[PDB]
Each structure stands twice: as structure tokens, then as C-alpha cells.
Amino acid sequence: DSWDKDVYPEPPRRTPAPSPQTSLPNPITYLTKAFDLLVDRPVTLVREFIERQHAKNKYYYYHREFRRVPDITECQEKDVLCMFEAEMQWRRDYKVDQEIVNIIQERLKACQQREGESHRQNCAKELEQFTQVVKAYQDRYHDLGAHYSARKCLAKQKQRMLAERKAAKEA
Amino acid sequence: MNMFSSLSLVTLLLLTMPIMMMSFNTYKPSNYPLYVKTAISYAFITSMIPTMMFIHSGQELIISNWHWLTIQTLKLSLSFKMDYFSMMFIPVALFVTWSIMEFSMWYMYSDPNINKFFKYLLLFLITMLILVTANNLFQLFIGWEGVGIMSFLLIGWWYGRADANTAALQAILYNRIGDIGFILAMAWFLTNLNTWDLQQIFMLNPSDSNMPLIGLALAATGKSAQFGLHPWLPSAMEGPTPVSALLHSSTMVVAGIFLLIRFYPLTENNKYIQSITLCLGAITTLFTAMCALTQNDIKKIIAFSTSSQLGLMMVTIGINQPYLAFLHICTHAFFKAMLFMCSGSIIHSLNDEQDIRKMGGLFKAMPFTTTALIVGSLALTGMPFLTGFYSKDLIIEAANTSYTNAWALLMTLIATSFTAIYSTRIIFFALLGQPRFPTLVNINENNPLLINSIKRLLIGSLFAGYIISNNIPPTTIPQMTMPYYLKTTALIVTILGFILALEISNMTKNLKYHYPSNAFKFSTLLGYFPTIMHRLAPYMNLSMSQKSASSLLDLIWLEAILPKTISLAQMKASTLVTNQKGLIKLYFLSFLITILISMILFNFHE
Amino acid sequence: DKRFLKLLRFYILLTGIPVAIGITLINVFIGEAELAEIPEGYVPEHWEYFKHPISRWIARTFF
Amino acid sequence: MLKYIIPTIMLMPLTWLSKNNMIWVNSTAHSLLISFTSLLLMNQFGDNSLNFSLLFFSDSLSTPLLILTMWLLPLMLMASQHHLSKENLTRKKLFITMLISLQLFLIMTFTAMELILFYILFEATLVPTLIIITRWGNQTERLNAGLYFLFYTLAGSLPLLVALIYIQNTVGSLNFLMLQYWVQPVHNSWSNVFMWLACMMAFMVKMPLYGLHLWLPKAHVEAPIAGSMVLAAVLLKLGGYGMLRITLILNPMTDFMAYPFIMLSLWGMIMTSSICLRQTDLKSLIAYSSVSHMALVIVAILIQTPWSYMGATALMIAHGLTSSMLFCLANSNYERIHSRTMILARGLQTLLPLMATWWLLASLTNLALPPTINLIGELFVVMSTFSWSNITIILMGVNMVITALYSLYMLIMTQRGKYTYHINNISPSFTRENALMSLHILPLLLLTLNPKIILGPLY
Amino acid sequence: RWQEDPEPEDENLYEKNPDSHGYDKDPAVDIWNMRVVFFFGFSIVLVLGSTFVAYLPDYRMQEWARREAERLVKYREAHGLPIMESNCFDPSKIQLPE
Amino acid sequence: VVRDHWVHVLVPMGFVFGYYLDRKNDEKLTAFRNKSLLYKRELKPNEEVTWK
């Protein structure tokens, strides 16, 4: 269609077949037919017309690729020229990570609606994946403050790594 | 999906078109009120199609069409939840609003600003539909405060009247206090669940939900006018009667109960919240029904009935029956809007007389208004198989078979008896006996706008409860086994209320004067809550504002300790420096002192 | 009051109608760019990373 | 920034070389064209600010403030030209020159890349503002108001000057880009306690901070309408903008140095909202409303979180358009009844219907009705303060209740009730007055559709 | 006391010019002032400026970030990698103290 | 150019002049044109500088 099914999965659709157990006519069936004739059909033709115009003028746009530069770990201290590139990279990855957590949150919300009253059991995978990604995001970026930077992120990581070393030292 | 999603949005888009036309000068203001009424009738028709699809197969969906704003990891989209609660409330609200609007064409005919009145009524409705279909909390807040502001504008319709402006600002004040809880719930959900979306809130299912749910209860306490924040609803009677009918059946007062229903996945697991809402509902339903027993303004009697019915809904929330509470919202809308339109019919015919003591003898003079009033009264009291019976009766027998606070259950049962008493008061004093109104008779209920609008709500007050109950899917286990005395409790206490009410009413006709009792004054003056609170709290706050905040601090002490002290010192120092005799002898004598201390004390020469 | 609102409506529509019509013709006859993979050895201009033609025009002309 | 500095300067020759009857037409027309081109500043990137040269840069914080500043100059001209009609022609041109020179210092202040250049322009705005208040104010008290305005600002600014020069000596640079990479933490010491205070007190006085706010009710009341419009909309935001920038170099000391000033603000807003309930002067009521709103901005800047910085930025923009509109609304009444007393003229909705609509819309934005950007900013600040400490919801909630009471009290007292019988010169609203009102409210309500451009760098 | 002019009377612009727009005493200047305010204020800045803002090219690259995140999620889930790691920087490039 | 409307070019010319001076500033800040690690590339056969 338009989006990738892998990034935004949707289980296969299973609609039951009509099994009328009444002699009465179904009002929804005739309303659906009227909707197709009076709404879907004229709307579809107007779109097919517009698509005929867009095919006569076909042009492209691209997704910007960003080459990787050295991280703030490789920057000599107070070396602004290398700090600037690492800092800009870190900010780009920060925004992307925000959108990753949004994708995982959108999967979780779609599952909860889709599964209805069975969501508590049928959305356990999406809950787990959301829990893991939120934990990773919290470790990277939480508590940095409004004036966050790659330097502050590194200091937060080093503090976390030091505690992990000490806890293992206990073992 | 294409028809369901498409039709459920035209309903909302259809209602905004009169607003767009008015705001964009593209309308024929000949009969704008008829235009607005027609659009509402067509919205009701288009709203039935999605509802029928839900009735058929339980089809529900969420529409997140427009991405509005992303705050880091909180994406906010314009979303609409088309579920069980949305698909049944919307057609009911539109159907009731269809009658109120046709009724208001007759009732507000003489108003020079009737066009603006119908625009405000339509905005009132649009903000309620935003509230009821909101899928995230921010969208809900937009409609939550939208109905609050439209309520302010309509209650204070007659803005030359000081009482209408006091009542309007009172509604904002009490609802803003409730809104503290709404903001609290939003902040907790954002902090602890990283979401304002209803789906993520339920998926994560917080276990320690005391704080968010207390905030939600506080918001519902204000909007639904429960005990503590209750006085504003009776005061809202300052508005034109069409406002009261719409503000009490649909829109405002029901939003508080609806908010707790929307969050039943959380409340259904938190016992401590259930106890609080149960007791909050029980005191409200008992206290307000007690107040209605002695009111003489017909609108205030009906207003206190709404407060007592909303209290009953909160009790239903308190016993973990959100779906019964929702059913009561839907059934209540019919006969309560009808009752207000019946009182408006009487008030109009008696030259804006509202005291029941100056009515009487209208049973035969206003036959159609009489019929609707009796049907509305019987439905309110749970008469078997009228619309009210299909919610109220199930609520009472679900409350005496639950594991529940015994005082709350007993207080709720007494309130049911009181419901039959004040209902009998309106019929006895407005319809029966001899006329007590002025001598120039002008009664006339023969306008088709009046008749048709009430007739539709009369058909609703008879069959709507039966239709809805037989079409909604089951979502609980109805508890149908119980002792006979628990099954028929509601029916019996109602009958006892009618009998006791009739004896009390008939004793007003005896030639005996009795000094008022203490309990009579307590009921008449609303437990003195408005008399005390609305004088004491404004006085303390307003006196502090002037005496301390403004006078003591801003105009005195903050001036004294900085600018006034600093500048005074500079003036004193200036006079010391410049007050000299201009005498050569003194200046040069000071030179010698300076040179000496420069050497003796400071060693500037070393 | 009525004169002001008529003047307000007139001057908003004076440019609003040409804009709304202009936008519709752009969306119909020009249309949006299709997403494509950057060809090999090709350096897109900075305004070729945007989808809508009006966004592309803004980037190229001003930014 | 020369594409805005130069044309802004060229407004001065334009005004002085205009025909005597076209000074308002010409200046208003061309200040609107400058306002139009300011939208080119919204070429903002996710990672990098827009850095034009060694002197000037623009980011998502300064860009909305710049756009607000250049939009206000046209509006200040329309608001002024009625009460200056009898003024001498050359004195009219000088008045316009002060407004233009104020805009020039503002657009350079918000874009100066070096903090000492910011300081000089930050201070240069005092001169035109002081002249506008004292020369063209109406009352005797305008002279005292100018003195309070001048010395409250300077008492805080002079310590800031010493602190900035000290920072340049020790760090070697005051360029803001450099300070982002060369910043070092501030360790506890009595020496650093006073560096922190000298870096923050000048900006707190401008906000103003509760306790240091006494200059504002005097200055915002004695000024001519244009002076009040710029004082409330922009000049108060020099304090907020300055704090947002300098707090970068004050960490982690802001952790405990913020406490006395958060307390002054949290309690200050409840105190200054309550004051508005018993205010007898309509302009004074509006001025005290600004103190209440800017208390939230101070708290949001001090707690220093991503949500509070977004909320602070939204609040500063939203307050600028709202507070400016309210002063203009009250001025229209004053130009009819020549008094600032709120209770003097009542029931005005009966005599001026359309202008009563503007009063309502202005009041609703003031009490932060959703989804206005006033609510968006005020809500984001409350969300972040709740995380800082849950009990702050009590003070935020109470302030929201009191703010609605005084916002609707002002609406009810002036617009509703019965008209005062003896006031018989309430002429119908002029086109100029209606247009001036709609040029505040319409942009304010449009921004709701696209709020991301006023949420600042942390969006 | 002294020699001083009395306070001049109030001038209602509508008495001389019932069609006054409130800008100038001169009816011709008054019309021109209204025209520039409305055309440049409403027709240009508000209408075109609103259109400009709506079609800003990916303001602050929020749309690129969503496209980039989708690319990363697709690549990481296909290859079995974690969606997001707790460490922002590779710990092989870090030298812990002590 | 008329005697009555020449003053209306002062601000438009100031914008053009300011726009021009801004571009000349960009010509003194080319030390890293096509030299940053993020954007350094080759020049297209016909190109002269990556950005002017």
C-alpha cells in the first residue's frame, strides 16, 4: 500500500461471512450499496482524474542520508570543530530515537484497540517491546535537563557504567 | 469501515456548518433558528447509521486523522473514539437536542438575539460531542472546558440581571475547582504512563491509581455537581428554560459521570475509589432530594432532581456498574429534558410565573402539557416499563445485592422515596386544585412547535428505554437472583413516597397554622450551605486580597524595605555632605585631620 | 460594526480565494513528489528533499 | 539579520521625509512589510540553529520573539495615532522614531550571538522606553514611574555586567555557541552564589519576579498605549529570554539557587492573581495579570526540563498577544471616558456589541481556555512542575481558579450589567479600533493550528 | 494661578465625517490608512503568512526523523538487533576512571 | 519616481541592501565549504563551489 507492513504490522483480517437467521431485510446491506453508488463511485472517479494529472508530471524527492562522523567520545576536550559535528549528530539521533519510541507506542495503541476485550492477553508482545524500548530510551536520555548535550549524555552513561562495574565487583 | 468512519464524521462536520456559515456571512438570517434545527435533525439521521452498524456486529473503531503536535515522545493527534459509549450517546443527545431546539423556536420567539441563542446552543452541543468522542485527554479537556464556557455564556444570557452574572460566574468557579482534578490526572498519566491516550492508559493498567482517580473524581464532583461543589447547578436556573433543559439532560451535568465511565477499566480494580464515589453519590442523592422537598420555584425543584439523579449515577459508579450508569445517562436525558420543557410551557402561559404556589388548576387548561408532565414524572420515579424503569430499577437491585457500604445503600433507598415526594409536589401544586394565578387568563399550548417537540420526547420517555435495553450488547453478568424484598425494594419505597407525599400535600388544605420546624428551614435553605459558604469564602478571600496582598505587601512593605528605604538614606547622606558653612577655616581644618589620620591610622606614608 | 466585518471578510478573501484556488490547481495538476532512492553518484539539491511542491518552492527560493 | 536591521532603520528616513498627513499611513504600511519578511526566519533545523554571521544568529527561541516584535510595531502605530492627533508634527515624528529605535534594539537583542552585545542592546531599550513613558504619558505620576522603571532595571543590570565580564575573563569568550561547548559546572562556594545571583537578578527584575515587581504596575499604567503594548508584550520577555540563555552556564548550582525564587513565584502568582480581584483601575488590573502569568515562566525556566522550556516559550508568545490586546481594549474605553476606573463605565456590551466580543475573546485567552496557545503553554508548565514536585498542582490549580475569577470579573464589570446613565459619549467603535483588536486575536488563534513554531528549541 | 489655555473640548470624529474609519480627520487619508492596514495586515501578512507557515519545508526535520526511525526499526527487527540500546556511545571507546 | 511616492522605495531598498550585505557576509565564512566531515564530497564536473 503506502507504508511498510513490517514497521507497522497488522495481523491478518478474519471477517466472518454473513449468516442471516432472520427473514427481515438488513438495513445496513442496502445502506452500504447506496453508499458505494452515491459516495464511493463519484469520489473514486474524481480521484482517478487527479491521478491522471499526477502521472503526466512525475518527479521525485529523496530521504536525506547523513554520513556518520566521530562521536563526542573521540573529541579532544574544548575542540569545538569536532565537538560541533559530534553534537549535531547526537541531536539527530536523539530526535530519531524519539520517533522510534513513538512507533512502538503506536503499535501498542493499535493492538489495544484491535484486540477488544482480549487485549490484556493478545497484546503481551507489544507491551514487552514497549517496556524494553522505553527502558533503553530512559537510560540514554532521561534526567539530562533542558540544556542536554552529548557531553551530558556521556557523563550519564559513564556514571551508569561505573555502577554496573561495582555491582559486578560484588558478585 | 469506509461507511462507518465516513458517516461518524459527517455528523460532527454537519453540526459545525451553521457555525461556519454564521461566522463567514454566507447565510440567510431569515430563519437561522430553523436552519440550525434542521441541521441537528439531519445529524441525528446520519448518526443512526454508525449506531446500527455497532448494534449489528459491535463494530467500533478509532479515527486518528490529523497529527497535531509531537512533544518528544508524546504524539498528539486529533482522534475520535467511536465505541459503545459514543455510538449510543450521540444519537440520544442529538434527538433530545432536536426537540429542545424546536421548542426554543417557540419559547425564544420574542428574543431579539434568538439567532445568537441558537448559535450558542449549537456550540454547547459541539463541545459536548468533542468531549464524548475524545480519544486522548487533551481533546477531552478541550470539550471539558468548552461546555464549561458555553454554560457560562448561556446561564448569563440576560446579562443586565446581576443575579444571572453571579450565577454564571458561580458555575465557572465551581467547575474550575473541579478542573484541578482533571489537570492532576493529566499530569499523573503523562508522568507515569507517558501518554494522554486512553488506549495506552488501559494497556499499561496502572495498579497504584489512587492519585489519578482521585483527580478524576474531583473533576466529576464539579462537573456533575456532587456534594461539596453542588450549589452551582440549582443556580444555573437563571438561564432561559431551553438552557436548563439542554444543560441538564445532555451536555454539562452528564460530562462528570461520563468521565468516570470512560475510565472504568481503572476504577473497576481500585476498591478505594469505589468507596469514595459510592459515599459521594449517596450523600449527594439524599441531600439534594431532601432540598427539593420544600422548593417552590418549579425550575429549582427540577434542578434539584437532576442533582439527585446524578448522585444516583455516582452511586452506580461506586458499585462497579459503569454500564448501568451510562444507561441512566441515556434514559434520564429523555424525561428530564421533557420535564423542563413542560415547566417552560407552564411558565410561558402564566407570564413568566415560576412559583408553584401561584399555579394550580392547570390539569384541564393545559391538557398536552399535563400529559407530558405526568409521563415525565412517572418515568422519573421508575414506573414499570417506562424509560426510567430500565435503568433505575436495575441500579437499585444491583446496589442492594452488592458488597457495599450499608449507610450508602440505605441513604440511596431513602432518596428514591424522596423522588416520589417532590415529583408529587409538582403535580399536586401545578396541575391540581383551583387556579391561583392572576385573573387575565392567557393559557395557550396550541403552537405546533411546542406540541411536536414535546411529543417526540414523550414517545422517547415511553419506549426509548425499552428499545435501548433490547439493542445494547451485554457486558456484565446481570444479577437476577435475589430475595423478593430486594427485588421490589425500589418499587415499594416509591409507592410509600407517593402515599406519604399525598397526605402531606392534602394537609396544606386544612385550616391550621403550624410554626415552621427546624428541619423545614434546613431543607428550604439548602442546608445553609450556600448561605454560609457563599458569604464566608468570598469574604475571607476578597478581604485578604485587598488588606494583605495588595495593601500590606504591595503598597507598603515591598515599597518600604527597598525603594523607600534606599532613597531615604541617599537623601540623608546628601544633606550631610552638602550642608557646609562655606568657611575657608573649616575646610582647611578638615584637610589637617585628613592628613593626620592618613598617617597615624592608615600609614599611607609607609 | 457591520462595515468592519464586511471589510474584514473582503480583504481576507481578496487573497484567500486566489490562494485556495491556486493551491487546488497546484495539488491537482502539479501534484506531490514521489519518494525515490537517491540515484548512484547523484547529489540532490537541498530543495529536493521535500515532498510538496510549495514546500520545495519555499526551500529553493528563500532558504 | 541585516535584511531586517537595515529596513527597520530605513523606517526612520521614511517617517521624516513623509508628507505631514502620511506619516501614519507610510510607517504603518512599511512596518507591515517588514513584519511579512520576518517569516523567513522560520528556516529552522532540528539540530543546528540558524547562524548568519559572527554577530547574529536565530534559533527557535529567538525566532518567534522576533516575529512578535516586528508584528507589534504596526499595531503600536495604529493604537497611538488617535491620542497623538493634536500633537505637534515634529513631536509626532519623534514619537514614531522612538518606536522604530526600540524595534531596532529588540531585533538585535534577540539575535545577538555574544552575551555582552546582548547586554548593551538589552540595556539600550531603556532609553526609548523611558522617553516614551515620561514624555508622552498623561499623568503626573509618569515621572515617578520612569524613575522606578530605570533604577529597578539598572540595579540588577550593573551586577550582570560585572558577572559577564568575569565570565569572559575566565572562559575566554561570551559567544553563545562557544559557551555551549566550553561550559564547565559551577561548584558550590559563596563566590559562585553571587555569580549566580548577578547572572539572574537583572532578568528577574525584567520578568518581573514577585517582590521586585513594583516598577511594573507603575510603568505599565502611566505609559501611553503604545508604551504599554511593547512593555507587556516584548520587554518583559527580555527577562525570560535572558534567563533561558544564561542558565546554560549556571548548572548544577541552579538546583538549589532556584528554591528562593521558585517560592517567590509559586506564592507570588497566587498573591498577584488575588490582587487583581480587588483592583479598581482597569490598566492596573491588567498589569498585575502579567505578573501572575510571568511567575509561571520564571518557575518553568528554573526547573529546567524539556517540557517546561517548551511551555515557557509558548507562554511568552501567548501572553504577549493577549496582554497587548487587553491594554488596547482598555485604552479604547479610556479614549471615550478619559478614566481608568473600572467601575466607572458599565454595561458596555449594550452600547458597543462587537467590541464586547473582543473583550470576551481576550478574556478567554487570558484564563487559558483550551486549545489556545495560552492553555498549551500554561498546561506544559504545569505538567513539568508536577513532576518537579506533585504538591505544586495545588498552587497551580488554585491560580487557575483565581485567574478565571478576575478574567471574568473584568468582563462582567465593564461589559455586563446596566450602562452608567450619565456617560453619553460612547461613540460606536471605529474601524481602526476593531482592526487593531482583530490583529491581536486572529494571529493568536491561528497559531493553535500550528503550535510547533512557538514551542522553542526543545520541540 | 497663571495664564493658561482651558482644556480643549472633545472631538468626535463622526460629527464631521459620519463615514470615518477612525484613522485621520482628512477623509481621503482616513480611507487610505484603512486600506493599507487591511490589505497589508489581513490580505498579506495573515493570509499569505499563514499559507507560508503551513507549507514550511519539514520544520525542524520532524518528518525526516519519522522516516529515519522507520528505516532503523525495519533494519533492526529484520536482523534481530535490539530496537534501542541503553548505551548511546560504544563502550569500547570509553575509559572508565579508577 | 513621482514626487509623491518616492519615499516608498526606502524600506524595500533597505531590505534588498540588507539581503545583499548578508550574502557578502557568507563569503567571509567559507573556511569550511566542502570540508566538514558530514558534507565533504567531490565537485560535480561543471560545479565550482558547493554553496555560494
Ligand SMILES: CCCCCCCCCCCCO[C@@H]1O[C@H](CO)[C@@H](O[C@H]2O[C@H](CO)[C@@H](O)[C@H](O)[C@H]2O)[C@H](O)[C@H]1O
Ligand atoms: C468544509 C465544508 C464542506 C461542505 C461545504 C458545503 C457548502 C454548501 C453551503 C450551502 C449554503 C449554506 O448556507 C446556508 O444553507 C441553508 C440551507 O440551504 C440556507 O438556509 C435556508 O434553509 C434553512 C432551512 O432549510 C432555512 O432555515 C433558511 O431560512 C433558508 O435560508 C441558507 O440560505 C444558506 O446560506
Ligand SMILES: CCCCCCCCCCCCO[C@@H]1O[C@H](CO)[C@@H](O[C@H]2O[C@H](CO)[C@@H](O)[C@H](O)[C@H]2O)[C@H](O)[C@H]1O
Ligand atoms: C411507581 C409509581 C407509583 C404511583 C403511585 C400513585 C399513588 C398511589 C395511591 C396513593 C394514595 C391514594 O390516595 C388515597 O385515596 C384518596 C384519594 O383517592 C385520598 O383521599 C383524600 O381525598 C381528598 C382529595 O380530594 C383529600 O382532601 C382528603 O384529605 C383525602 O381523604 C386518601 O387520603 C389516600 O389515602
Ligand SMILES: CCCCCCCCCCCCO[C@@H]1O[C@H](CO)[C@@H](O[C@H]2O[C@H](CO)[C@@H](O)[C@H](O)[C@H]2O)[C@H](O)[C@H]1O
Ligand atoms: C529592589 C532592587 C532595586 C530597587 C532600587 C530602587 C531604587 C529607588 C528607585 C526609585 C527612586 C525614586 O526616588 C524618589 O522616591 C520617592 C518615593 O520612593 C518619591 O517621592 C514620593 O514618595 C515619597 C515617600 O514615599 C514622598 O515623600 C514624596 O512626597 C513623593 O513624591 C520621589 O518622587 C522619587 O524621586
Ligand SMILES: CCCCCCCCCCCCO[C@@H]1O[C@H](CO)[C@@H](O[C@H]2O[C@H](CO)[C@@H](O)[C@H](O)[C@H]2O)[C@H](O)[C@H]1O
Ligand atoms: C540595590 C541598589 C539600588 C540603587 C538604587 C538607586 C538609588 C537612587 C537614589 C535616589 C535618591 C533621591 O531620592 C530621594 O528620596 C526621598 C524619599 O524620602 C524623596 O523625598 C520625598 O520623601 C521625603 C520623606 O519621605 C520628603 O521629605 C520629601 O519632601 C519628598 O520629596 C526625594 O524627593 C528623592 O530625591
Ligand SMILES: CCCCCCCCCCCCO[C@@H]1O[C@H](CO)[C@@H](O[C@H]2O[C@H](CO)[C@@H](O)[C@H](O)[C@H]2O)[C@H](O)[C@H]1O
Ligand atoms: C496558491 C498559494 C501559492 C503560495 C506561493 C507558492 C507559489 C509557487 C508554488 C508552486 C511552484 C511550482 O512548483 C514546482 O512545480 C514543478 C513541477 O513541474 C516541480 O518540479 C518538478 O517538475 C518539473 C517538471 O515539470 C521539473 O523541474 C522536475 O521534474 C521537478 O523539479 C517543483 O518541485 C515545484 O516546486
Ligand SMILES: CCCCCCCCCCCCO[C@@H]1O[C@H](CO)[C@@H](O[C@H]2O[C@H](CO)[C@@H](O)[C@H](O)[C@H]2O)[C@H](O)[C@H]1O
Ligand atoms: C535570594 C537569596 C538566595 C540565597 C541562597 C543561599 C544559598 C547558600 C548556599 C550555601 C552553600 C555555599 O557553598 C559552600 O561554600 C563553602 C565556602 O565556605 C564551602 O566550604 C569551604 O568553606 C567552608 C568554611 O565555611 C569549609 O567548611 C569547607 O571545608 C570549605 O571547603 C562548601 O564546600 C560549599 O558547600
Ligand SMILES: CCCCCCCCCCCCO[C@@H]1O[C@H](CO)[C@@H](O[C@H]2O[C@H](CO)[C@@H](O)[C@H](O)[C@H]2O)[C@H](O)[C@H]1O
Ligand atoms: C524569598 C523566599 C525565601 C524562602 C526561604 C528559601 C530558603 C532557600 C535556602 C537556599 C538553599 C540552601 O540549602 C541548600 O540545599 C542544597 C541541597 O538541596 C545544598 O546543595 C549542596 O549540598 C548537598 C548536600 O547538602 C550536596 O549534594 C551538594 O554539595 C550540593 O547540592 C546547598 O549546599 C544548600 O545551600
Ligand SMILES: CCCCCCCCCCCCO[C@@H]1O[C@H](CO)[C@@H](O[C@H]2O[C@H](CO)[C@@H](O)[C@H](O)[C@H]2O)[C@H](O)[C@H]1O
Ligand atoms: C513593495 C513596497 C510597496 C509599498 C506600498 C505602500 C503603499 C502606501 C499607500 C499610500 C497611498 C497614498 O497615495 C496618495 O495618492 C494621491 C495621488 O496619487 C496623493 O494626492 C492626493 O492627496 C489628497 C489627499 O488630501 C487627495 O485629496 C487628492 O486627490 C490628491 O492630491 C496623496 O497625497 C497620496 O497620499
